Amino acid sequence: APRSVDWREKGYVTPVKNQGQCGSCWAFSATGALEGQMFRKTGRLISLSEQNLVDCSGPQGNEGCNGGLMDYAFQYVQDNGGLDSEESYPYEATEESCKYNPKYSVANDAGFVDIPKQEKALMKAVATVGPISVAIDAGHESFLFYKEGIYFEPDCSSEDMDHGVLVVGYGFESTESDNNKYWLVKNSWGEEWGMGGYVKMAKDRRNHCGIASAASYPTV
Ligand SMILES: *[C@@H](O)[C@H](C[C@@H]1CCNC1=O)NC(=O)[C@H](CC(C)C)NC(=O)OCc1ccccc1
Ligand code: NA
Numbered sequence: 590a591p592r593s594v595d596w597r598e599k600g601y602v603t604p605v606k607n608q609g610q611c612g613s614c615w616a617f618s619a620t621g622a623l624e625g626q627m628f629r630k631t632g633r634l635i636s637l638s639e640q641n642l643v644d645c646s647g648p649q650g651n652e653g654c655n656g657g658l659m660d661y662a663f664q665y666v667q668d669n670g671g672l673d674s675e676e677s678y679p680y681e682a683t684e685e686s687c688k689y690n691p692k693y694s695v696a697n698d699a700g701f702v703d704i705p706k707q708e709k710a711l712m713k714a715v716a717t718v719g720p721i722s723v724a725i726d727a728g729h730e731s732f733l734f735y736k737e738g739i740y741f742e743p744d745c746s747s748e749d750m751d752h753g754v755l756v757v758g759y760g761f762e763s764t765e766s767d768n769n770k771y772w773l774v775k776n777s778w779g780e781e782w783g784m785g786g787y788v789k790m791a792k793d794r795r796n797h798c799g800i801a802s803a804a805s806y807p808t809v
Contacts, residue, residue, distance in 0.1 A: 595758035605786030607779035609682035611654035617777035618753035619662035638678035645687035653684035659722040663701040698807035727752035747799035
């Protein structure tokens with residue numbers, strides 16, 4: 590596998606979004622992964638509607654601003670036969686009744702793939718598929734104030750994840766401790782957070798923060 594991967598430079602990744610004060614991280618992770626796979630297939634990068642997922646994917650098991658799962662989101666798009674664009678169905682940061690309109694659908698999928706729970710298996714997926722939806726333990730003050738460098742939190746759990754994000758690559762940089770590898774992760778907390786909305790998460794460090802514990806992507 591490659592030593593460094595960045596799908597943003599290949600055109601797979603839309604700009605950083607902001608979920609506001611709604612527990613909809615799962616919807617942004619899922620649209621991010623489906624935005625990448627749709628571009629892989631059509632060569633067109635179109636931002637997808639998280640509000641569509643928040644409002645409409647309850648029958649698949651999601652609960653709006655109170656949480657959800659990326660796999661449930663991919664199942665909705667398959668069961669529903671489409672997903673509306675961000676411009677047609679914009680984000681309001683609040684759960685409402687479903688307003689899906691197939692005329693404005695711009696995405697489809699035919700299921701999803703669950704990656705084995707090993708950082709080695711994740712590395713392979715990122716290297717060959719595109720951006721990957723993942724879950725992490727983001728519940729630590731150090732994650733809120735992250736600015737730069739490789740993030741490592743000694744009391745992060747790898748069993749208890751609470752936040753869905755998007756791995757868009759991986760790489761390295763020399764560090765004091767010689768733990769130099771990282772996952773490149775796109776968040777949904779706006780541009781102001783982290784490094785332009787991104788974070789470098791420690792890689793090959795005992796599945797840090799559970800990044801490899803619930804990874805998946807849609808099949809288009
Ligand atoms: C991210 O914004 C969100 C925060 C949650 C929801 C409101 N309070 C929170 O702490 N995280 C999730 O939605 C999270 C993402 C996973 C990929 C880790 N999932 C979640 O909280 O799921 C709860 C749930 C489990 C099973 C079925 C339905 C809901
Ligand atoms: Na924790």
